[PDB]
Each structure stands twice: as C-alpha cells, then as structure tokens.
Subunit: 313 residues, 3 copies
C-alpha cells in the first residue's frame, strides 16, 4: 500500500471556515510520520494552493460555485497524476465538495472504480433540490451518470463529467437525509446502509455485504470518501454538521480495517474536520486523533497487532 | 398513523416531583409541530387536570394510592375516547404508574392488544412485594390476569380490571429487577429481553423475536409503554431511576422505527422524563431531545430518510 | 460459587504506584458485603503483606524483577491454599504482573485449567522483547510452555514453572499489541478475539466460541484474568494503560455473566485499577464501581434479575 498525500485546504463548499485548516492540523498529529512507522511509501504532494476567486456570486441558490468548481478541477488533476504514479491518493481536505474533484481525478485513470461513502448524509442534493445551497452537500449529484441532464450548468463545473453510476456506490452511516435525496436514493436504486441497517445487521455483516456488492462480479479499484461527521460526534465533535446516533469509534475502525484487507483501496478522502469548531482544545485533539486512526487503519494498522516478516524470538 | 396526544402531568407514582412537568417541556421542544412536519394528523387533547386528593394516607406500604388510582382511572377513560376517535393515543406523562390507566383505557376498545414494555425495570411489583411502596414500580402488577387474586384491594383501584395475560407482553431493556419480580417473571412465563439478551442477540434479532412473539399467531393492536430510563442515562439523564448499562440512542431508535413499520402501533407512552432531575440545563435538553426523537420514530421519521409520494426531480 | 478473597497490593509490575491501593478501595465499595448479599460464602484472606526488596536493580531491561518475582511466588502459594480449601480465588491486586503468581498457584491444584484473558493488551512480552521493561506486560510470557527456553533466567523467578500451553488460553479485548507479541500470537497459534473480532462477530458469538474452544473437548476449571483496561476508559478511566476503542460496560458484564453460567469459574483476577490515576473523584468511583459490578457478575448477579428458591407470592 503506497500512498500519495494531497493537501486540499478548501472550505467554500459550506459556510464555516476552519475546515481549510484540516490539512494543517492533521499533519501536526504526525500522520506522515505514523504512516511511515508502518509498511508504506509516503510521498507528500503538499497543500494545493487554492486560488481566490473574488467575483463569485451565487448561482440561483448555489454558493461560491466557481470557487468550489475550480477547487475540484484543480484537485482532480492532482489525484490523476498521483494515481498515474501508482499511488493511493490521500485527500486531506476541508469540506466534502472537493469529493467531486477526487472521484473525478481518480476515475480518469480508473473508470471501473467503486465508491464507499461513509457519511451521516448522502450529499446527493442537486443544485435544484438543495435548500442550503452549500455544495459540500451536492458532490454526489455531479458524479452520477443517471443524474445526467438533471444537474444544470453551474459556473465552474463545465469540466465535470459524471464518472459513476448509481450502482458503483454504497453509503454507510446515513442518519440525516433530505426528502429529495431520499427520492433519488430509492428512485436510482442506490445501495446503502444507514444507521438503521447498521443497528439491525451489525457492522460486521454491513461490511460483508458492502464489499460483496461492489466486488461481487469482479474486483475493481476502490475509493473511500470518509466524512468525519459519519462517526458519532462524541468521537469527532469538531465538524460542521454533527448528527447524534452515529458510528462508533470501533465501527469506524472496523470499516477501514476491512477496506484495507481487500488490498483494493485506491483513493481515500478524510473530510469535514474543522478544528475551529471544537468547543475545547480536547474536542479538537479528539476529532483529529480519531481522523488519524481512521487513516492508519486504511493503510495497515490493525487492532490485533502488526509485525514485519521476521523472526521476533 | 393518526395520533391523539394526552397530557398526563402526574408524579405521585414515585417520590421526586418534577416528572409532572414532562407534558410541558416536551411540548416546548416542539413535538406537536414536528409530528405535523410529518405524515400525521395531530390532535391535542391537552394536559389532563389531575385533581388533588389531600387525604390519601399510605395503604400499608403503598404510597398515594387514591391519587395514583384516580389519575389512571381518569387517563383510562381519556385513552378510550381517543381510541374511539380512531387515533393512536400518545400519553406524555410523569411517572410510570399512569401506565395502568393507559393499558386499561386502550384495551377497553381493543381487548386483543399486545404490550412491548421498554424499561430498565419490570415494574411488576405487587402491593405485597414492593419494598419502596412507589406505585410507578407496580403498574404491570395490576394489569396481568394471572396476578388476579394476588393484588389486594387498594384504595383508588376498585375500578381496575386486569386486561392482559402474561403472554401479551414483552419486556425490552431490563437491568434492575427485584427478587419477587424475577420470580413472577419466570413463574408466569413472561417473555423478555434484558440487556443480556440484547448483548447476546443484537437489537436486530431482539426486535425480530419480540414482534414475532406478539404478532406470530395473528396481527393485533400494539401498545408501547416507553420508560425513558430504558435508555442509558448518558442519553436520558433527567429521570428518577437511572441504571447504567442501558440501551443506546441508536437501539432506542431502532426499536420504535421497527414498531412503526408494523403499522400496528395503537398506543404509546413516553414516561419518566423529569427535567428538575437534570444536573445541567444540557442534561435536560438532552433527555427531552431524545424523548422527542423516540416519539417521532414511533410515527414515521426514519434515519435513512423520508419523502412524500411525489417526483422530486 | 464459593469465593476466596486475596488482597494483592502490588505495583512494581509497572511505574505508577497507586495500583497497590486497589485491594483497599474495592473493599470500601463494599465488595465483600455485596458478594454476601448474594448466594456465596465469602472468606477474606486479607491483604498479602508484600515485603520490601531494597536491593533490586534492573535485569538488563526488566524492572524490579526480584520484587515482582517474589510477589507472585507469595501469591501463588496463597491461591493454592485457597483452591485447596475448595474456593474460587479472587485476586484483587495492583498491576497485572501478579497474574504470574495467580495462574501458577491456581494450576498447582488444577493442571487442566483454562485461561480467558480480558485485556487491551496481550501482556505476552518476554524479558527479551519488552521495550518498557515493565513486568505487568510480560506475565503471560512466563506461564506458556512453548515459550520455555525463550524466557531467560530473571532474578526472582527461578520458582517459576510454565503451567499453560498456547491453546489453554483465549484473549478477549485486544487493541494495543506490540510487534513481537503479535509474532508470538500467530506463531504459537494463540486463540484470540481482539476488538476487531468483537466488532465483526458480536460479543455474543465471541463468548460462544471462546467457551466452546476451551470447553469443547472436556470441561475444566477456568481462570479469568481481568485487566480493567480491557473496558473502554470511559468506563474504567483510573488505570495506568488506557486505550480507546474498548469493551463496553454491557459487553464487560456479558462476558462474566456467561463465564459464571458455565459453573466452571475457579480463579478470577481484577487488575490494574489505580485510584490515584483518576482525574476526578468521580472517575475513581466510576472505575471502582465498574470493577465491582464485573466481579458480582462473576459470582451470580444477573441483569435479568435474581431470586432464591422460594415462593415470592
Ligand atoms: Mn459529507
Ligand atoms: Mn456528513
Ligand atoms: Mn418504568
Ligand atoms: Mn424504569
Ligand atoms: Mn494487563
Ligand atoms: Mn491492559
């Protein structure tokens, strides 16, 4: 498992601004140093310098469309080059809008990618169904093919090309879904495991089916888009859209340890960590701490232990 | 799902007095407004004016027997009229003693009702087995038929008529059961899932069996008597008899979402919420918040999402 | 279930010193009084007077080897006499080093004993693999037979005789295992259920397999070595080596209730409770409280209730 770290300090996908410090604070926790403490080749591509777009009025309801649209365009080319250097792209960003650029760039080199989206939300609103206008809640809407012809021409997204069908993706962790989003869900037949299915089936079976549904037919590259608000806020409090009744720390770790085990992880997003939203210095370290553990799990660290191919006795 | 809200500000089923404010504080959280935000017809029958009975000395050990007995008599007729108006009675009360009046009134119109009792306690003490004398811990004892001839003549309960057998009921959440209560349990063969069975089987299977045991033979109206102390106190702290090792928020939501799905919910009690018992303004809002979510789940709100029968695209 | 309480106020198995107060503070919680409130014969053998060994320099990296070694030798003879008086030895100690003396003494009278080790760690480091030198993280290494000839001659342990194979033991709760320890695990084929297997299988199945793997062939005496850091620190915070992502309070209770039910419990250790490590008086009572509940579960207290062989009606 060879990683390719990409800093994406972007926040215009939503209101609150501290999420652009994510790349920074995660790096201080020692992520790159801990990844190396393992069995991976870590190559830091730094923090993408996101240019400022002054003139960016809302498109109807959409907010900062040219800023978000250009930030993904920028990140898409980055994830593409990294995948071209044969590396698991790691997008440490701000808000989830960037997911558009990640899934896009990742797919350019791997059209047969599968997407597991751990989130408390489906983030599948269209520019025409969103009531918030916040784009970090619409990324999935720009990526799905069935939804082609439903997504209007929004300034800053003409470079977009829906790279995934409604079947190449599974949601895990849902607990705050809008009416229109739920309609798309059922209507497009998108496979998902909300907190209800997790409660009923157990995180064990949940992951069995998820990986079975994406890798059943054949094996394919996998993209994990992890929104920290997927886990219960008692675990990741410093995030913009917390919702109670979330995935436990343990469950969070189980999902990724299982993903790692497929040996099919290709792309990973760790999003929505916003330090300035912590009510205490501890809630910050706690949110960051859990973000880093989730990541290490993605690249090898196992709870039962780890050991090199040598004789320890 | 058509509801019939009934305010039952009663506290004499136990010592602590703030539980009579339950109806009030739940209403401020916006319950009636949120129920309407859904797919239900909400008709508020207000807060039952519970008359004061000055002369009500204890019956041996039983405390405030004429006060509790009359409060249930009063509520029974209320739940009966509502069920007669074809509505799911919602009893927002104080202590669990009132359950006597709810199960009674509910049954008058539906003798074939099934009872699911989510509680950390069995509340099945008799006036002769209770060591506390608190009636909010004896309600089940007055309702069971097998226990006919075991329950002495207590002032204020001559109007009582045991409306349910030991089989028409299932306990979920048990973790603090008295010796005598456990004897009745095993002796009368009452079906239950304590925190041990929940741990072993999973809340998924637990609900599968519970609904299977009550609806196996045939379908019948269902009465959910929900004591908030059923959930772990980290979720509903403002309550009189907290016991650690309880049902999670998630599990609490799973139970009701499943109950709603039967389309057989007929009666619902949300009990033991006592604001004055919160050690902080937050523990109050947290207990109320969770009480309201539990209720909405009972009438439709699903974690995977909700949407009207229309085309959202 | 007849118990034999043994106080083991020892802390030299690790750095922090407040763990030797464990015996004391657990006794104040009323353990002996609560055990009696049940169906057991409680005989207190008091707090072993652990003699002070001034001259005890480290052995290479091993720390306080003669102090730890002599404390186990002392406790081994104690657990042996108690088992000889036909009683379930209860070792309320400090650090986990003492486990060496408990498993040893216990086995002297029962060579066919089975060991269930609830811990966040495997505590199977050798004096040659440990990087901390702390012996409370090496106890298992002195007890296993396969590891005979791998454990150097350490001052204070010449009295040791490996009493268990790699198969007579099951680990439950693992989440912080060293490289060398993981090598021994896989290499010696030790059966274990880390937090990953618990997440995947459920504590129900976990206990099914554990007891099945130790009692499959035939029934045998069982030794439960319970390290409080096995449970999530939100449950047992006052302990020296906390690790997040642990066993819940509920799971902690399920493990022991199931163990009790085998009727095969013979030896029990309740370790690593360190009051002085609590950041608040509440974290102390919370850690102690949970330690006592875990113990009562081991001797009978059930969450569904308990009752004598009499007619309560
Ligand atoms: Mn998101
Ligand atoms: Mn989210
Ligand atoms: Mn109750
Ligand atoms: Mn209760
Ligand atoms: Mn240990
Ligand atoms: Mn440990």
């Amino acid at each position: 498992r060879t990683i390719g770290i990409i800093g994406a300090p972007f926040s215009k996908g939503q209101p609150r601004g501290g999420v652009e410090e994510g790349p920074t604070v995660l790096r201080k926790a020692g992520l790159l140093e801990k990844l190396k403490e393992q069995e991976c080749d870590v190559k830091d591509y730094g923090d993408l310098p996101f240019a400022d777009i002054p003139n960016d009025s809302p498109f109807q309801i959409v907010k900062n469309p040219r800023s978000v649209g250009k930030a993904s365009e920028q990140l898409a080319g980055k994830v593409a080059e990294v995948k071209k250097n044969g590396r698991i792209s790691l997008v440490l960003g701000g808000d989830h809008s960037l997911a558009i650029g990640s899934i896009s760039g990742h797919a350019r080199v791997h059209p047969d990618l599968g997407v597991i989206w751990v989130d408390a939300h489906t983030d599948i609103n269209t520019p025409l169904t969103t009531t918030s206008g916040n784009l970090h809640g619409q990324p999935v809407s720009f990526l799905l093919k069935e939804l082609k012809g439903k997504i209007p021409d929004v300034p800053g997204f003409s470079w977009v090309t829906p790279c995934i069908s409604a079947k190449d993706i599974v949601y895990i962790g849902l607990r705050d879904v809008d009416p229109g989003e739920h309609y798309i869900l059922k209507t497009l037949g998108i496979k998902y495991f909300s907190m209800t299915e997790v409660d009923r089936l157990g995180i064990g079976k949940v992951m069995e089916e998820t990986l079975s549904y994406l890798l059943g037919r054949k094996k394919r590259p996998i993209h994990l888009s992890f929104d920290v608000d997927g886990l219960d806020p008692s675990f990741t409090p410093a995030t913009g859209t917390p919702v109670v009744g979330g995935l436990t720390y343990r469950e969070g770790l189980y999902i990724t340890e299982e993903i790692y085990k497929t040996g099919l992880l290709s792309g990973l997003d760790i999003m929505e960590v916003n330090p300035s939203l912590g009510k205490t210095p501890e809630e910050v370290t706690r949110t960051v701490n859990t973000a880093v553990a989730i990541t290490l799990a993605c690249f090898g660290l196992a709870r039962e232990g780890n050991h090199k191919p040598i004789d320890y006795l």
